[PDB]
Design a binder for this molecule. Structure first.
Ligand code: GTP
Ligand code: GTP
Ligand code: GDP
Ligand code: GDP
Lengths: 50, 419, 411, 426
């Protein structure tokens, strides 16, 4: 019984790890979106100053 | 006539200053033995500004830096009486380096600098190279700045200070030192040229394309900046601009004296003969945002003022259309209620090895990003009093850190206000 | 720039037999910090001390420095603290005084002891108490050997470990944990010695000690003295117990094939399979790390490696410390000992960090101590030696306070 | 004054430009170190169109090598005249696309185009008055076709007022190297019709034919094929670099040859090209140059123009020539073979002369003929594209990357209406 409890717990921990990895991808690309989008805001800002 | 006294504090300050005197002594043609061997007679005329024994004062708290100074070349040229030097060592404790160990070394460093100050006739100012992360460099150097202003209030004062960055973080108590050091700098130094290792490592990666940038080359880059900024005193020009004239042209408000610096030209060994040396080309390297030596991208904000010190036989007409073009093209990146935000200067003597060089000093409003970048780390650590007892059990109390916080907070507020 | 080293007990002076062999071999002005050596071996049994007196280093050590008692402590903290310590400790500290008197720029003392025994626990704590009174401000580097959970040579070592740590809190300023079972596993896994003795253990302990004092003996690109560990690694006055690790602990065959560089050895210094304490730092959250670099290392890649560590997620950091590192670079490569089982390396790394996995060790020890104490087993030996029933329970509650401190700070 | 920047994409593009910069630098008398060593001053006054003086007689070519594989760039720098390019202009990825137009247009394009654009922007603002851009690439590969075509699109959004040449080889059924050639050719052409100014179609099939019959080479490696292509390309832009009795610049030639805005795929030839066996047995007069020019077997594309009709044609002559002889010889070859020429435009040929022949020759020529036979190529490729897409072969390597089925229907529709409208004007 314990030999199989261990397999279910290992499965649960891996299901969390692949989730943690995917969360880092979301963190990274969203940071990239801020850089490109704030550039867009500066361009519109430049447009109105002119 | 016009005189500049040098003061080097801490391990970081000493190795930067060691490389500085190497470059200047080379420019003035003085050998590592201490005798003149130069060619031109323009160099002898303005060698009293720095000298032939240098007019420097090294100061620290560990013998290793002094031993490493006399070991290398141009280490036999310092006067052994100027090696004012403690013995115990603060060691990355601002309280120790500002209250405990400073309290007995400061009297002796002040005596030697006072003798070295009154030895000449008319001071232009002092020039201090130090850090903001270490203890014996930052704290002791900081107290020296405060003591000097009480004795010499009408003289200029330069501070080449490096700041800690979270990407390049040496010690754990970095924000505890940087915040307190700024709290004293904002009211004491005349102006500061902010440096940091992150931007320096970044410069040596992209532009210099060096494989292993040891501390020798970083100190070499900072040294080229310091040689370029005082060339106007040491050599005639078609338009002269000493230290005082740069300060009054760059600082619109009395608390806005933290500058970002760049240098041009900087090219890899491979692309060294594949390039041209023209004023427009140097300007595109000057105003590049990846060429500033701080971790604060100036294109995330506005410029207040900017200056460019040129060296070499140039046509002043070219200077003016380049400066006006950069102002009329990117008009949003510059402040609106000051027209013609650019100060310029020309000197006829280039650095040894180049035909035409330039030095950029930009007073931008992107500086509030790095100071907020620092206050974040400081805020979290201070809230639960981490590492606080190593400072508190020395004389420092809690309101001192709160006071430094308020000064950090209202500085970035007025940068935002003037933005 | 001088540091003196005292060695207590059978384990302390055997470790010293490796430390001083390495020091004299390494120095063949830089030697001034150690050199006659600046040491005092002291023990209550004369058998191990006279091994030094009849050994090869008969002439190196001044005769008086070798202190030896007349009878053993019988693996009793009480006997080695109140009965026999009282006669030897006064002679020991009367020597440390004039050795420190000969010195001028003393950085601190560093002590070597094992807390499972009688001498190392009893008069080791007693000696540290009187040194704190006499000097106080000078750093005392305590490299202790706590007993392992499953590997044990004694029976009553829980009693001694608890009773020693109670004083080890407020006396030493820097305290480094080293178990024996963990090092056994290290020598089996990486050094592939299937049958190790104490000699191999003591040899690589000396390598660690020499790596953290090399900043004083030799100039580096970024030097870090003994006061820096005091400041950069101890966030609170009651949390000073540091995991240690070293890399690369590699055999001759493997080392030449492997490409040793800063990034991979900085990684290797953070896995739990290469630490000197059997504990799981994944179970804890790091507070602050300190990285000693020796040899051919530029500041770039040490900074690059530390960036990769902070972004990985199998090891997490505390929220109160975003910049949790203190690096240090020195030029001199690590030396080797003929007969030693380590090969020459271009660059080595010694990590000294602080986490909450240590908070797990003290609970694991408390349970074993608690079980025996309730039915007063083995208590009557210590009580006859001069102690009472009170101090066992009060030392127990002191460890309980420490457990609560680790759970609260990690929150 | 008038300025041309150079852009080489992919492996094929890198070698073509390498032989090109060797030939041009030779024409200007610059040694592989990059210093001036010419004799007259006819060469010095017009080296600003292509090169930039660096320091003390150092002239650097204004070229940008762009690709995704390290070996391709390394090979150009190992060989001679490799040490003359500025290392900043070696914009270069690390992963690789590998004959995948989707990877070259959506996956690896999105992270390299910005960097090469920065180099292109710096290289464009380094000069005063732009004349146009010059791009060399292929239509079968992925890192040249897809990435290079997106580069074309980015430029048209940046500089829509300047000229643009693209020298592109096309895949043929008889010379078919890779397997995904149709899925690359159709989408590339689709993007070319909406972004490029004019395209000069080349192909490897015609290149093999020339090297067997006329050149009679024994081992024609790619060095010699690129030698032909470089001599032809230099012939187009000779007029900006040298003065002549009748100057014809690039924009002047474009407006003369393009009767309708979508009809900008040109066929090329070059004269004279002889074996070293028959070089001694002929002369150098205008008739020998014109007959070898207008020969269908001497065209540099595998599309026989004698299977259709010439709409317009142009000839750029080089050497000390008489314009009277020029137009009379051009008029003669237009009057005899009158059926091959379009009817509602008289004198379908624009002509120009330059007074500086290439080194080693007294007289050369270059033909650029906007014919209507190019519809055969698009049919010959489109049928292969349609044959695969009907039952979705190889589809998933693009579909799983971001394109849908509607993108293929769009690509086929634009090719279909293009072939229909070429057939209409036929
Ligand atoms: N690393 C190491 N540990 C040792 C060595 N010798 C003994 N120990 C450890 O010491 C502990 C046992 O206590 P001891 O050091 O023998 O006690 P002691 O210092 O001799 O004090 P007394 O025996 O009462 O005189 C156990 O943890 C042993 O593993 C050694 O040579 N190297
Ligand atoms: N008699 C004579 N006519 C010439 C000569 N050169 C050019 N032409 C004539 O010029 C006419 C075309 O005009 P060009 O002067 O060449 O060109 P343009 O007037 O400057 O107009 P653009 O080509 O747009 O610059 C042709 O019909 C030629 O007959 C020449 O040397 N002698
Ligand atoms: N540019 C440069 N920075 C240095 C050098 N040496 C140390 N530093 C920086 O200084 C910081 C540590 O300051 P430290 O030397 O310990 O100051 P001190 O202890 O008060 O003398 C680190 O963050 C380093 O990045 C050097 O030679 N050049
Ligand atoms: N004329 C010529 N054609 C070439 C050369 N190198 C490759 N090619 C052609 O390019 C086609 C394949 O394109 P490829 O090099 O893979 O393009 P890329 O990978 O996207 O840069 C083949 O059909 C070759 O005929 C060359 O040096 N000269």
């Amino acid at each position: 019984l314990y030999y199989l409890l261990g397999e279910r717990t290992r499965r649960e921990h891996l299901a969390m790890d692949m989730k943690v990895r995917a969360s880092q991808q979301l963190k990274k690309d969203s940071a990239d979106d801020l850089y490109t989008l704030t550039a867009h805001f500066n361009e519109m800002r430049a447009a109105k100053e002119q | 006539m016009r005189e500049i006294v040098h003061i080097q504090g801490g391990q970081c300050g000493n190795q930067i200053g060691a490389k500085f005197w190497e470059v200047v002594s080379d420019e003035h043609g003085i050998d590592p033995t201490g005798t003149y061997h130069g060619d031109s007679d323009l160099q002898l005329e303005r060698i009293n500004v720095y000298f032939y024994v240098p007019r420097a004062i090294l100061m620290d708290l560990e013998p290793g830096t002094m031993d490493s100074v006399r070991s290398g070349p141009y280490g036999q040229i310092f006067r052994p009486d100027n090696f004012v030097f403690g013995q115990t060592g603060a060691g990355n404790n601002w309280a120790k380096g500002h209250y405990t160990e400073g309290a007995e070394l400061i009297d002796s460093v002040l005596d030697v600098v006072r003798k070295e100050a009154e030895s000449c006739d008319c001071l232009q100012g002092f020039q201090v190279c130090h850090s903001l992360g270490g203890g014996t460099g930052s704290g002791m150097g900081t107290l020296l700045i405060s003591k000097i202003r009480e004795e010499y209030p009408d003289r200029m004062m330069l501070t080449f200070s490096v700041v800690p960055s979270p990407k390049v973080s040496d010690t754990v108590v970095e924000p505890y030192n940087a915040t307190l050091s700024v709290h004293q700098l904002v009211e004491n130094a005349d102006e500061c040229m902010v440096l940091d290792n992150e931007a320096l490592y970044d410069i040596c990666f992209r532009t210099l394309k060096l494989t292993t940038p040891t501390f020798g080359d970083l100190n070499h880059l900072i040294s080229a900046v310091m040689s370029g900024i005082t060339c106007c005193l040491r050599f005639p020009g078609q338009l002269n601009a000493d230290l005082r004239k740069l300060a009054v042209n760059l600082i619109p408000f009395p608390r806005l004296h933290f500058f970002m610096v760049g240098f041009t030209p900087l090219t890899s060994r491979g692309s060294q003969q594949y390039r041209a040396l023209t004023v427009p080309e140097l300007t595109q390297q000057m105003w590049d945002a990846k060429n500033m030596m701080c971790a604060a991208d100036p294109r995330h904000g506005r410029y207040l003022t900017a200056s460019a010190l040129f060296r070499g036989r140039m046509s002043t007409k070219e200077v003016d259309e380049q400066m006006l073009n950069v102002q009329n093209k990117n008009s949003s990146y510059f402040v609106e209620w000051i027209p013609n935000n650019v100060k310029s200067s020309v000197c006829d003597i280039p650095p040894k090895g180049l035909k035409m060089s330039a030095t950029f000093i930009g007073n931008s409003t992107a500086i509030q990003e790095m100071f907020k970048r620092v206050s974040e780390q400081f805020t979290a650590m201070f809230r639960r009093k981490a590492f606080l007892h190593w400072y508190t059990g020395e004389g420092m109390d809690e309101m001192e850190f709160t006071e430094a916080e308020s000064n950090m907070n209202d500085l970035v507020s007025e940068y935002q206000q003037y933005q | 720039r001088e540091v003196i080293s005292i060695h207590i007990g059978q384990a302390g002076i055997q470790v010293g037999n490796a430390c001083w062999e390495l020091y004299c071999l390494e120095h063949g002005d830089a030697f001034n910090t150690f050199f006659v050596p600046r040491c005092i071996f002291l023990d209550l049994e004369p058998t191990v001390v006279d091994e030094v007196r009849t050994g090869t280093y008969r002439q190196l050590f001044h005769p008086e420095q070798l202190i030896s008692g007349k009878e053993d402590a019988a693996n009793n903290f009480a006997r080695g603290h109140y009965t026999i310590g009282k006669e030897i400790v006064d002679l020991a500290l009367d020597r440390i005084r004039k050795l420190a008197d000969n010195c001028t720029g003393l950085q601190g003392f560093l002590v070597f002891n094992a807390v499972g025994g009688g001498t190392g626990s009893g008069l080791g704590s007693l000696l540290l108490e009187r040194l704190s009174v006499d000097y106080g401000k000078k750093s005392k580097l305590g490299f202790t050997v706590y007993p392992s959970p499953q590997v044990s040579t004694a029976v009553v070592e829980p009693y001694n470990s608890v009773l020693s740590t109670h004083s080890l809190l407020e006396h030493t300023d820097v305290a480094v944990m080293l178990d024996n079972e963990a090092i056994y596993d290290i020598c089996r896994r990486s050094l592939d010695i299937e049958r190790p003795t104490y000699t191999n253990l003591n040899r690589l302990i000396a390598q660690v000690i020499s790596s953290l004092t090399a900043s004083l003996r030799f100039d580096g690109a970024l030097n870090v003295d003994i006061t820096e560990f005091q400041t950069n690694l101890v966030p609170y006055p009651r949390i000073h117990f540091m995991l240690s690790s070293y890399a690369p602990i590699i055999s001759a065959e493997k080392a030449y094939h492997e490409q040793l560089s800063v990034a991979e050895i900085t990684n290797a210094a953070f896995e739990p399979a290469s630490m000197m304490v059997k504990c799981d730092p994944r179970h804890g959250k790091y507070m602050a790390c300190c990285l000693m670099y020796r040899g051919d290392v530029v500041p770039k890649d040490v900074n690059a490696s530390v960036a990769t560590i902070k972004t990985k997620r199998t090891i997490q950091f505390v929220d109160w410390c975003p910049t949790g590192f203190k690096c240090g670079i020195n030029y001199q490569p690590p030396t080797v000992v003929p007969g030693g089982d380590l090969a020459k390396v271009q660059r080595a790394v010694c990590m000294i960090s602080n986490s909450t996995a240590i908070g797990e060790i003290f609970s694991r020890l408390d349970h074993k101590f608690d079980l025996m104490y309730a039915k007063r087993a083995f208590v009557h030996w210590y009580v006859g030696e001069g102690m009472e029933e009170g101090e066992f329970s009060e030392a127990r509650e002191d460890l309980a306070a420490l457990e609560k401190d680790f759970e609260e700070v990690g929150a």
